[PDB]
Amino acid sequence: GLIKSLAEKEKQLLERLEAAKKEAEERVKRAEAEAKALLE
Amino acid sequence: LVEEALRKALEDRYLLAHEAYAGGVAALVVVHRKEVDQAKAALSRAGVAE
Amino acid sequence: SKLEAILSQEVEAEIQALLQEAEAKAEAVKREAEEKAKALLQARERALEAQYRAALRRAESA
């Protein structure tokens, strides 16, 4: 019944996953920007 | 007895907790969600109740 | 725990997968643009030159 351990790790990871998604979309949005410019 | 049921299913991939209140200890098994059937089943073999 | 170790590595592999996914979608965006821009420019150059060749024709014809 290690509790603490398992009850910290699940938080730490989670907000790292959240963050991943943001940086991720940004890359698409970068190419989107470039897409916009290149036509414009 | 339950601990044995759990031990067989869960191994060590559970960390197994109890807190007293007299007349027994209110108990938790924490397992992965994935491990859940095996854990519930350990209770089932035992006849211990939620 | 060993228990949380698996949770860590699992979540982390999703982090890695999102970024990777994103890159491919970015390329896909990228590749639209390239073709599109090119595709716009040719046809309208094309058209003007025909409107040129035809324009002089009428001139000459006068």
Numbering used by the authors:
A (entry chain K): 21 to 60
B (entry chain N): 152 to 201
C (entry chain L): 2 to 63
From the paper:
The V/A ATPase from the thermophilic eubacterium Thermus thermophilus (Tth) is one of the best characterized rotary ATPases. The a-subunit is connected to the A3B3 stator in the V1 domain by two peripheral EG stalks which form a peripheral stator apparatus (A3B3E2G2a1). In addition, the dodecamer c ring composed of two transmembrane α-helices, the d-subunit and the DF shaft constitute the central rotor complex (D1F1d1c12), which rotates relative to the surrounding stator apparatus. The proton motive force generated by respiratory complexes drives proton translocation through a proton pathway made up of both the a-subunit and the c12 ring.
Here, we show cryo-EM maps corresponding to three different rotational states of the TthV/A-ATPase. After refinements, 57.9 % of the particles corresponded to state1 and gave maps at a resolution of 5.0 Å, higher than those of state2 at 6.7 Å resolution and state3 at 7.5 Å, containing 15.2% and 6.3% of the particles, respectively. The position of the central rotor DF-subunit in the three different states corresponding to each state is in good agreement with the 120° steps taken during the catalytic cycle of V1. This is accompanied by re-arrangement of the AB pairs adopting different conformations in each state. Similar densities were also assigned as ADP in the map of state2 and state3 in the nucleotide binding sites, albeit the densities were less obvious in state3. However, the stalk region of EG1 adopts significantly different conformations in the three different states. There is a pivot point of the right handed coiled-coil of the EG1 at both E/94–97 and G/104–107 in each state, resulting in a circular motion of the stalk.
